[PDB]
Design an enzyme around this catalytic site. Structure first.
Site, PDB file in Angstrom:
ATOM      1  CG  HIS B  41      38.824  10.046  60.390  1.00  0.00           C
ATOM      2  ND1 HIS B  41      39.374   9.596  59.649  1.00  0.00           N
ATOM      3  CD2 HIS B  41      37.326  10.839  60.347  1.00  0.00           C
ATOM      4  CE1 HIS B  41      37.968  10.135  58.845  1.00  0.00           C
ATOM      5  NE2 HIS B  41      36.945  10.510  59.315  1.00  0.00           N
ATOM      6  N   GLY B 143      30.888  13.923  56.704  1.00  0.00           N
ATOM      7  CA  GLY B 143      30.109  12.731  56.370  1.00  0.00           C
ATOM      8  C   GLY B 143      30.290  11.452  55.294  1.00  0.00           C
ATOM      9  CB  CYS B 145      34.876   9.952  56.724  1.00  0.00           C
ATOM     10  SG  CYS B 145      35.453  11.120  56.163  1.00  0.00           S
TER      11      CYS B 145
HETATM   12  C1  LIG Z   1      35.563  17.230  54.995  1.00  0.00           C
HETATM   13  C2  LIG Z   1      35.307  16.469  53.934  1.00  0.00           C
HETATM   14  C3  LIG Z   1      35.573  16.102  52.939  1.00  0.00           C
HETATM   15  C4  LIG Z   1      35.017  15.325  52.070  1.00  0.00           C
HETATM   16  N1  LIG Z   1      35.609  14.124  51.846  1.00  0.00           N
HETATM   17  C5  LIG Z   1      36.747  13.938  53.148  1.00  0.00           C
HETATM   18  C6  LIG Z   1      36.404  14.977  53.986  1.00  0.00           C
HETATM   19  N2  LIG Z   1      36.207  14.588  55.014  1.00  0.00           N
HETATM   20  C7  LIG Z   1      37.829  14.888  56.367  1.00  0.00           C
HETATM   21  O1  LIG Z   1      38.583  15.615  55.358  1.00  0.00           O
HETATM   22  C8  LIG Z   1      37.470  15.442  58.221  1.00  0.00           C
HETATM   23  C9  LIG Z   1      37.247  15.792  58.586  1.00  0.00           C
HETATM   24  C10 LIG Z   1      38.908  14.449  58.216  1.00  0.00           C
HETATM   25  C11 LIG Z   1      39.940  15.453  58.418  1.00  0.00           C
HETATM   26  C12 LIG Z   1      41.186  14.874  58.175  1.00  0.00           C
HETATM   27  C13 LIG Z   1      41.779  14.007  58.357  1.00  0.00           C
HETATM   28  C14 LIG Z   1      41.086  12.801  57.728  1.00  0.00           C
HETATM   29 CL1  LIG Z   1      41.369  11.475  58.104  1.00  0.00          CL
HETATM   30  C15 LIG Z   1      39.931  13.101  57.739  1.00  0.00           C
END
Ligand SMILES: Cc1ccncc1NC(=O)[C@H](C)c1cccc(Cl)c1
Ligand SMILES: Cc1ccncc1NC(=O)[C@H](C)c1cccc(Cl)c1
Lengths: 304, 304
Positions: B41, B143, B145
């Site tokens: 992503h 961030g 990820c």
């Molecule tokens: C904001 C955040 C906080 C904690 N972990 C990961 C995130 N980040 C995400 O979940 C990102 C924006 C994302 C959105 C939809 C699908 C996927 Cl695979 C990844």
């Protein structure tokens, strides 16, 4: 989101761990620049530990009696000195992996990461707090002596602790990196009592702010309190008295959540008087006190 | 003595973290040998995440669009490929800090350490369990990820997890290092439900053995039970059913303490039916399930 008992990345400290052997005793040492630091009890036999005269014991030792091994290579010892409860072994080679560092004496209630080591080898890392009674509730076995506690600010490692002793109660005692014990402890195999421990109030309050930030809000109530009223409750429940200095450090969390410090104190007051009624806060069924306000701000913002 | 939620020393993994930028998105990558691994992503904009066609999105990207920075130096990208939900960026330089490593797919209930990272920089390390519903209750912000989960056996790092997504419930989802999600999750900004989670019974039992080893014995009783009777209780309290395979892995702890596995099950049965009555076990007021029998054996013996 999510809130974890997070430790600093231990890499910069792993590169400093060495094994120190003197006679038949082996423990861990910290190699920074051309000096290896370790607990002075490396020079004692089990029989010496009952009532050691460290000056007399060290006089029988020469540079060549201290065997320092970093990973698989041997360091040549060219000087030895005792500073309080730590031995400083001057080596002929500066550690190429020496990070930027400082030696700091932390205050009780402050937190730090511990890199637990055996035979100069890192086995685990965990985060802990220096108890108000100057003990740490670590996880240490025989051979863990010399393992260190530290904090990291971007690229600088601030070493604050060196493990020396396990008290008869199973709690741990150690020194700063100048060999001065935290608390009233002495490096002797004699029963030594740690003071009455108290809960680090400012840390619990910081942790309640971390809970509100992460969605756990059930404990928020319609009440407020005063420092004086809150301190009456704190005294009854063996919590450290909250001061205006503690309120001041909680300012950024109060600013972020919009919950005034004294309103959070009233939530804490009600949890102390009523318990959790079988509920959990941040996956814990008790009031957590091993996160400082600085730790909550760092974790909740992503400081690397 | 003492028992801590201990993570592996993160050094070998810190040396592998890089920052990957594609377009305006930046996340963390894992540089092993001449390949950088990161969540696919990284190629999406916020608008793409609603319903991304990754094949079509990747077709618009060339080697030169992936910016990989290790610390302060730039890596030259000479190939790119998508494998399931991970991108593999072939670089012209092998990571000089590549430890001995394997990619493994862990089972639910197994534990691992997470090195949380932002912009390719490590900020914290914590130990966690892969939930039976294939989620992890981590501590991750935007961030994070690309941050990875791992285990270490002497000198070999077994990477088991890469962080991808935060579910609307605040729990986390990710993949193995071949990009296959743990659980039914997809890398899309769509509401996705994690299954009903259960408590990892064998881990709680292992943790009760760690408590007996460290002196917390108040919960030991004069009762015993059968696998069938215990499983009736486990079902009622949403605990995973205990199997003979779980009893077998608890054998070394049963051997050390002299408490038969089914006697420990009867203690667990009584704690489930009565609660803790305001008491604590290993400093916890709830039944801890993030320590496997292997973790307890390693921690309680000092495996480095
Ligand atoms: C904001 C955040 C906080 C904690 N972990 C990961 C995130 N980040 C995400 O979940 C990102 C924006 C994302 C959105 C939809 C699908 C996927 Cl695979 C990844
Ligand atoms: C056995 C053990 C377990 C956990 N931490 C440290 C230890 N080791 C010790 O407490 C050693 C044997 C020692 C005895 C008396 C005084 C001093 Cl300064 C050091």
């Amino acid at each position: 989101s999510g809130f974890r008992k997070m430790a600093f990345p231990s890499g910069k400290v792993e590169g400093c761990m060495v094994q120190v052997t003197c006679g038949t005793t082996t423990l861990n040492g910290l190699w920074l620049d051309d000096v290896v630091y370790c607990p002075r009890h490396v020079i004692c036999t089990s029989e010496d530990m009952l009532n050691p005269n460290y000056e007399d014991l060290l006089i029988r030792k020469s540079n060549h009696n201290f065997l320092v091994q970093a990973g698989n290579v041997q360091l040549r010892v060219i000087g030895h000195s005792m500073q309080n409860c730590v031995l400083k072994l001057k080596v002929d080679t500066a550690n190429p992996k020496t990070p930027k560092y400082k030696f700091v004496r932390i205050q009780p209630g402050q937190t730090f990461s511990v890199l637990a080591c055996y035979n100069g080898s890192p086995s685990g890392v965990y985060q802990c707090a220096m108890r108000p009674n100057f003990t740490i509730k670590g996880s240490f076995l025989n051979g863990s002596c010399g393992s260190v506690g530290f904090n990291i600010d971007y690229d600088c490692v601030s070493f604050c602790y060196m493990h020396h002793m396990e008290l008869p109660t199973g709690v741990h005692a150690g020194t700063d990196l100048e060999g001065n014990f935290y608390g009233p402890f002495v490096d002797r195999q004699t029963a030594q009592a740690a003071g009455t421990d108290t809960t680090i109030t400012v840390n619990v309050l910081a942790w309640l702010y971390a809970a509100v930030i992460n969605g756990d809000r059930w404990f928020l109530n319609r009440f407020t309190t005063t420092l004086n009223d809150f301190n009456l409750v704190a005294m009854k429940y063996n919590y450290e008295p909250l001061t205006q200095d503690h309120v001041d450090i909680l300012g950024p969390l109060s600013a972020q959540t919009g919950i005034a410090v004294l309103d959070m104190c009233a939530s804490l007051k009600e949890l102390l008087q009523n318990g959790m009624n079988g509920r959990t806060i941040l996956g814990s069924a008790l009031l957590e006190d091993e996160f400082t306000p600085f730790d909550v701000v760092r974790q909740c913002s992503g400081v690397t």
